[PDB]
């Protein structure tokens, strides 16, 4: 009778929203909304060098029939505009996606005397990056530390270095000005296996991926991957969402 | 479309709304949206002692079945916001109203890859101001007469608009001094005069000058002595009517 359907549970979904209202806001137009039969809900801005993405806990979401079809549509939504600043709304009462074509995402919102449905189509060749669980350097931060290095790159524009250190454990930061902003191993950063690894990322990719993160206001893990192309991973949660990034050397 | 629908033409439209970006931006979450199976849509703003309405010209509109029942909702939304402007999206490629439930609209919108429906609850306590055509005083301004009013009030007051019968004149004193009065010449007609004297407050009455300037065409004024002294200032083109009604203070 009914398709499969996907909803979000709006008690720990409106908290998690109004948490990311700053990232929310500064989407662009090559932002993927994906949805999955997980149940999961993922954001995802793929650009040069630089992928973030942003996933929401299953706690979040309720899927009623697990044959529910992936499906990935633009956030920018070719009448309403941004579409995950739209369920932000404080007015949010239901919100559900169900798997009616092959072609398309039917999206429902309701508030109170409102109910809007939509049918967006779906993009079919869009890969999501995923993190490789092999890691060279390995670094956790507090997020004190991750508010010092905003502070120190706010104001650009340039290039960062990021060397790490075996014996004894530390982070450096280099900028390409000459400026450098180390961390030692103490109480406010944990070394999970630095040997001796660098990487050159673009400063401001650097920068925005600090800011996604910070809106958890939590630790953040920093790791660099020694895989196919020296690859600096970036990532912080908490227990509603988590904050990926992947940026390549240039 | 088994149930009424009424779509509207979009060549005509979308033209309407592009004129009247600077008004559809500025409407407040008092500004009413009807749907009438005349057919007409109806934008109407209620204030304190201003009332304006912008009707859609019915060039603008395409009727189903008359048996569409009249239709008024908020243009402030649930969660898309102002609805007008949502209208003016230059991706709007279809735009109907249909008539399913007596408790609310139900409206559909198209753009290339995309279809949405949404319904909003329609409110009953409210009416469409109209055009006494009853009018004490009649006086049409020429667009130049009105541009020359705005470019005169743009620096709270009482304007005070004072018309004499013979021979006509009609007078506009502000509470500094300045006055700023026209006889029967090219640039201003005179129908039906009296010797008349209104007060209204001057910031619903620039704004009220704002509004019929989006035509660039000639301006009617009036003053309506049926019920209670009524300032009526009026613009229409060919795809819409600005329509405002002011009334006096009270002490």
């Not at 137009?29 to 806990?57: A, D, M």
Request: proline share 5%.
């Amino acid at each position: 009778s009914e398709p499969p359907t996907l909803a979000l549970r709006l008690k720990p979904y409106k908290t998690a929203i109004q948490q990311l209202r700053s990232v929310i806001r500064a989407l662009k137009e090559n932002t993927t909304v994906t949805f999955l039969p997980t149940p999961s809900l993922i954001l995802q801005t793929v650009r040069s060098h630089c992928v973030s993405k942003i996933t929401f806990n299953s706690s979040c979401l309720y899927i009623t029939d697990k044959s529910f079809q992936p499906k990935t549509i633009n956030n920018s939504t070719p009448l309403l505009g941004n579409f995950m600043y739209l369920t932000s709304s404080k007015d949010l009462t239901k919100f559900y996606v169900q798997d009616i074509s092959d072609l398309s995402a039917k999206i429902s919102m309701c508030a109170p005397d409102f109910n809007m449905e939509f049918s967006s189509a779906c993009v079919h060749g869009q890969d999501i990056v995923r993190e490789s669980e092999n890691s060279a350097v390995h670094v956790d931060l507090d997020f004190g530390v991750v508010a010092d290095l905003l502070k120190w790159i706010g104001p650009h524009t340039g290039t960062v270095q990021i060397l790490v250190h075996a014996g004894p454990p530390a982070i450096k930061f280099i900028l390409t000005n000459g400026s450098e902003l180390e961390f030692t191993s103490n109480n406010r950063v944990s070394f999970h296996g630095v040997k001796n690894m660098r990487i050159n990322v673009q400063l401001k990719n650097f920068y925005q991926t600090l800011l996604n993160c910070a809106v958890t206001k939590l630790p953040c893990t920093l790791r660099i991957v020694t895989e196919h192309d020296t690859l600096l991973y970036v990532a912080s949660r908490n227990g509603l969402f988590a904050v990926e990034n992947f940026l390549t050397e240039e």
